[PDB]
Design a protein around this ligand. Structure first.
Ligand SMILES: CC(C)=CCC/C(C)=C/COP(=O)(O)OP(=O)(O)O
Ligand SMILES: CC(C)=CCC/C(C)=C/COP(=O)(O)OP(=O)(O)O
Lengths: 261, 261
């Protein structure tokens, strides 16, 4: 099942790029949203605890919609991309409105969705505002900024994934996996995004390159995140299928990322 | 009651600027969202058909939240403003999430909100994408672009306003008022926004200044929009309180806007 994954990634990549295009997406944007592999695939992982296949394929795409929406919300603020700003915005909002719509139907408690989304919208947002204001300058201090725009971000789709997955789901363990997994990813993004498009202010790669964070710490943490992640997957019932993934990813930062630095 | 209005504008201006600030709003943004008079006031009009005072004050603020959210969504795409992009985005999303949350509680049919929002999200969005792509060059052709980002935009809060206002509301007449009123506003924005911050491509002011639209047509339409608006206010029960407003505004474009051109 390092198949089931790319099949859902293909299925979610299709649903999204079809909403993107039919809304006025340009050939550079449908193309952009189609190439957001990780985002499109992540939903599959968040719904691993979900039993019925259809409802699984269901919530997997719903999440993929809002996740990309959110993504484009970024690209519009970061402003790098080079795509048109007008589209990025509409399409963003479009996709969202939609995810809300579908997620809202796959819910047991309709009111449930808007709950999760609101619960800490202040943390998620004030956290990414301040994150980019007072750029971090040390681990205990980067792992704090990464705990918001990263951990809490995915934490929520984790919760949604659970509120729309169908009763008998380790509600909070799903979230634990989400929040844990998410950070290993952020480190994966920082350790890579320094080399590729030369970055440096607040970056987790720079802070290592200037004795502001010991490589041994980075690792310690990366190893804790696996621990924390693998822990939540076990929680009963348990998501055997994710055990391989958690390793596959954490092992990838360790193997091909941390070495460059 | 050209009082009840500024009192609700003051009440909605407060609710919003308090969410904006507590989320990380900068002193230039809380200041910006506080000065968005029209947006903050419009909700009051959309809930004129609503009987109970509390639920009215209720849905009036809820709408004010998403309306500003949407506004800032713009400012981020237009990109003019000069505020930080990171905030505009977060705060935007914040405010939204919130409006959804409150509106969602003042609903009879929870699922109802996400319905309205989705119903034509493709029209609202594809409409504002294409609107700015193939910039308009004549009335029958500007009044078409204005029929989306403008009419349908407010049409929806109109519908929400009705789905959260409380049974026994001219569901569709509220929307008629919204969509009608909205366009008179857009003309008010174009007829003014040409002089102020020198604009010209697709602008309803330019197209008059180059024989692409006869002033007599502009007026004909402005007069139809009042007709259409005043019509929906009458629809039973009827919103006597809005009759003065509809005039007050349409009469203002006629009196102090159309003359400059
Ligand atoms: C609060 C909001 C609107 C957040 C933006 C959405 C988000 C968390 C994107 C993840 O990007 P990333 O952190 O994985 O990397 P990159 O900066 O390259 O997109
Ligand atoms: C579809 C989206 C996200 C639309 C933006 C929100 C909106 C309709 C703002 C109204 O602005 P306006 O038309 O009254 O004038 P201005 O361009 O000056 O803000």
């Amino acid at each position: 099942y390092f198949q089931s994954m790319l099949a859902a990634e293909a299925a979610n990549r299709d649903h999204v790029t079809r909403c993107v295009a039919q809304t006025g997406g340009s050939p550079d944007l449908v193309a952009h949203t189609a190439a957001l592999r990780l985002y499109l695939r992540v939903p599959h992982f968040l719904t691993e605890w979900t039993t019925d296949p259809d409802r699984r394929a269901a919530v997997s795409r719903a999440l993929a919609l809002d996740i990309v929406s959110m993504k484009l919300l970024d690209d519009l603020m970061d402003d790098d991309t080079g795509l048109d700003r007008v589209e990025l915005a509409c399409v963003c909002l479009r996709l969202h409105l939609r995810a809300l719509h579908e997620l809202e139907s796959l819910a047991r408690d309709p009111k449930a969705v808007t709950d999760i989304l609101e619960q800490d919208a202040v943390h998620l947002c004030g956290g990414q505002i301040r994150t980019k204001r007072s750029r971090a300058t040390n681990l205990r201090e980067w792992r704090a900024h990464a705990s918001t725009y990263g951990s809490t971000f995915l934490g929520r789709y984790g919760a949604l994934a659970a509120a729309c997955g169908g009763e008998g789901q380790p509600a909070d363990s799903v979230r634990e996996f989400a929040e844990a997994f998410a950070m290993t990813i952020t480190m994966a993004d920082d350790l890579t995004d320094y080399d590729r498009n030369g970055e440096r202010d607040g970056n987790l790669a720079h802070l290592m390159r200037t004795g502001a964070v010991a490589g041994q710490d980075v690792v310690d943490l990366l190893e804790e995140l696996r621990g924390r992640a693998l822990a939540a997957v076990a929680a009963p019932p348990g998501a055997p299928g994710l055990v391989p993934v958690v390793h596959l990813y954490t092992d990838d930062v360790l193997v091909r990322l941390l070495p460059r630095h």
